[PDB]
């Protein structure tokens, strides 16, 4: 490791036996530049700027995950089949900008210390589940090898909201509350 | 709860003073245990835990595998930095500063990059949140206080907001 | 000019 001017992951490669599933994404200074939809075989950049000027071949991703799948098989045997331990994630909710009644905003649900990277994050306007207006990031890497994931909800401030998180490291599902 | 075996590979570059110092580290990780790595500073593969020797001993025994991982400093690090230089590193984003009592909070919302300097005009009886990350290339930082002058690399003249 | 990327080494059978 280091404490350098700019830290970049040109390949957060991820693959797990459960599913099975995997993730390929590049990061710069702790933010996600793009992930690759492994089933759609399409490089999905995360800023318009990047979409206008940067190109990455999804094939390099699919190749890399093929290696992880094999690699995982040998390390499973060598580790005498040592399974991943579930972590207890922490959840924070906050707004992209200060709240003004009748001014469009975005709620931001930070799910932190995710391991394994398998999670449900679902928003709640009162008791009801919000289907539309939701977006999220991929699992972003932490130097302690766990992940964080941020979910977003565009909303109109009115006269309550809940971020509902399901994870194997929790007993019951966790709901973090937020009101204006 | 369902059983799971997790694998991670972390090809990381480290840049200092432009590229006057470049360094790569690739990390092979079983679940959360990094077991083998390649540091461009060492120049060979090394076992990080007793889970690594078989992999590292085998990887150093292939010239091809060595030279190629070594070369990734040019073909991954140096090669991508030019493309960061064109894009990421010119992404200057103007912050938004307002003041609201709760203490009178000087919240500084939506800016890039991280390097920022908020101070109260010029006594210090203050409290400040860690540098919050939105996950979409903007940062939040609320600086509580029991005129707010905010300095960010993107602003020519520093932003000054009176009470 | 496309993006470079690291490639993981094969674990040994």
């Amino acid at each position, epitope marked *: 490791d280091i404490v350098a001017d700019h830290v970049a992951s040109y390949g957060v490669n991820l693959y797990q036996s459960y599913g099975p599933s995997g993730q390929y994404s590049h990061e710069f200074d702790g933010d996600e530049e793009f992930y690759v939809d492994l089933e759609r075989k399409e490089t999905v950049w995360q800023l318009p700027l990047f979409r206008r000027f940067r190109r990455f*071949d999804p*094939q*390099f991703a699919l*190749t890399n995950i*093929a*290696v992880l*799948k*094999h690699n995982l098989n040998i390390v499973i045997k060598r580790s005498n089949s040592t399974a991943a331990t579930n972590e207890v994630p922490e959840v924070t909710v906050f707004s992209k900008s200060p709240v003004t009644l009748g001014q469009p905003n975005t709620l931001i649900c930070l799910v932190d210390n995710i391991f394994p990277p398998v999670v449900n994050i679902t928003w709640l306007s009162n008791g009801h589940s919000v289907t539309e207006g939701v977006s999220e990031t991929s699992f972003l890497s932490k130097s302690d090898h766990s992940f964080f994931k941020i979910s977003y909800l565009t909303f109109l401030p009115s006269a309550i909201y809940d971020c509902k998180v399901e994870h194997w490291g929790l007993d019951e599902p966790l709901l973090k509350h937020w009101e204006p | 709860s369902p059983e799971d075996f997790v694998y991670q590979f972390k090809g990381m570059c480290y840049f200092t003073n432009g590229t006057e110092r470049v360094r790569l580290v690739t990390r092979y990780i079983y679940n959360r245990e990094e077991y083998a790595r390649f540091d461009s500073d060492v120049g060979v593969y090394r076992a990080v835990t007793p889970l690594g020797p078989p992999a590292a001993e085998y990887w150093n025994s*292939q010239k*091809e595998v060595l*030279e*190629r991982t070594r*070369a*990734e400093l*040019d*073909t991954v690090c*140096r*090669h991508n930095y030019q493309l960061e230089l064109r894009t990421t590193l010119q992404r200057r984003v103007e912050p938004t500063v307002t003041i609201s009592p709760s203490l009178l909070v000087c919240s500084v919302t939506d800016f890039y990059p991280a390097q920022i300097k908020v101070r109260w005009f010029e006594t210090t009886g203050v409290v400040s949140t860690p540098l919050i990350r939105n996950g979409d290339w903007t940062f939040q930082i609320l600086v509580m206080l029991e005129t707010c002058h905010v300095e960010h690399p993107s602003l020519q003249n520093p932003i000054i907001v009176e009470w | *000019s*496309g993006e*470079g*990327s690291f*490639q993981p*080494s*094969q674990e040994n*059978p």
Partner: T-cell receptor
Framework: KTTQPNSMESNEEEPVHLPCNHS???????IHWYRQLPSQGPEYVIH???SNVNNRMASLAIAEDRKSSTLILHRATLRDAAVYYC?????????????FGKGTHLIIQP | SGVTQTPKHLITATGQRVTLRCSPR?????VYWYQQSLDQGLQFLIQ???????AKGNILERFSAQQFPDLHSELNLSSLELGDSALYFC??????????????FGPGTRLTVTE
């Protein structure tokens, strides 16, 4: 695309310099040289990225601007008379780069 | 090198379908299929890594391949045509990539397709 001379003759015992052009080489591209004896299948000679590389088979001189290269064989015998392909591959691999082109017929006569 | 391939020589009528076998180097995990023709040079067809398909080239729909669990591969050429008369090469690689690794080739199949 790479471009190479169609044919090339050199005497036995003498060094041979086989030329190859590739003006649009990328920063992520490696240069590969393979040979193929008439009856036999093809076989790896050498590969490189920058400056000079030498294995127990041959030497490879890549130009300063990386837009050309030279496969050098220090001593050539009848057993080195074969076809020589010059290939650009991405260090990472993938389809576009596996296919061998026309190559060069290197004739070795006494 | 240590790449075996069968059958060495092959003569078949048009419209027919034959299958070419290849066992790669013992330590290796990749197989590449190539077609060398007088007019096309040494063309890449299809690559398999660790059992599943990895890279496709200019394989016709009339062509089919796969890599089995023991890592050997088969290549079937359906509705054989005159122009399909070519030299067919199997290749082997330790890893998924040949960008920085060498490829070890087999003897190849000599296939003529006659009227």
């Amino acid at each position: 695309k790479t471009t190479q001379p169609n044919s090339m003759e050199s005497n036995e015992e003498e060094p041979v310099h086989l030329p190859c052009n590739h003006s649009t080489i990328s920063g992520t591209d490696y240069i590969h040289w393979y040979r193929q004896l008439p009856s036999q299948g093809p076989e790896y000679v050498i590969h490189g990225l920058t400056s000079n590389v030498n294995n127990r088979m041959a030497s490879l001189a890549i130009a300063e601007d990386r837009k050309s290269s030279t496969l050098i064989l220090h001593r050539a015998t009848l057993r080195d008379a074969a076809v020589y392909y010059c290939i650009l591959r991405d260090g990472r691999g993938g389809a576009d780069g596996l296919t061998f082109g026309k190559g060069t017929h290197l004739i070795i006569q006494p | 090198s240590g790449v075996t391939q069968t059958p060495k020589h092959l003569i078949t009528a048009t419209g027919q379908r034959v299958t070419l076998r290849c066992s790669p180097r013992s330590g290796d995990l990749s197989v590449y299929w190539y077609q060398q023709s007088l007019d096309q040079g040494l063309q890449f067809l299809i690559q398999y890594y660790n059992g599943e398909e990895r890279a496709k080239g200019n394989i016709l729909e009339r062509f089919s391949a796969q890599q089995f669990p023991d890592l050997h591969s088969e290549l079937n050429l359906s509705s054989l045509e005159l122009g399909d008369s070519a030299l067919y090469f199997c290749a082997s690689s330790v890893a998924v990539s040949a960008g920085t690794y060498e490829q070890y080739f087999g003897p190849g199949t000599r296939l003529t397709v006659t009227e």
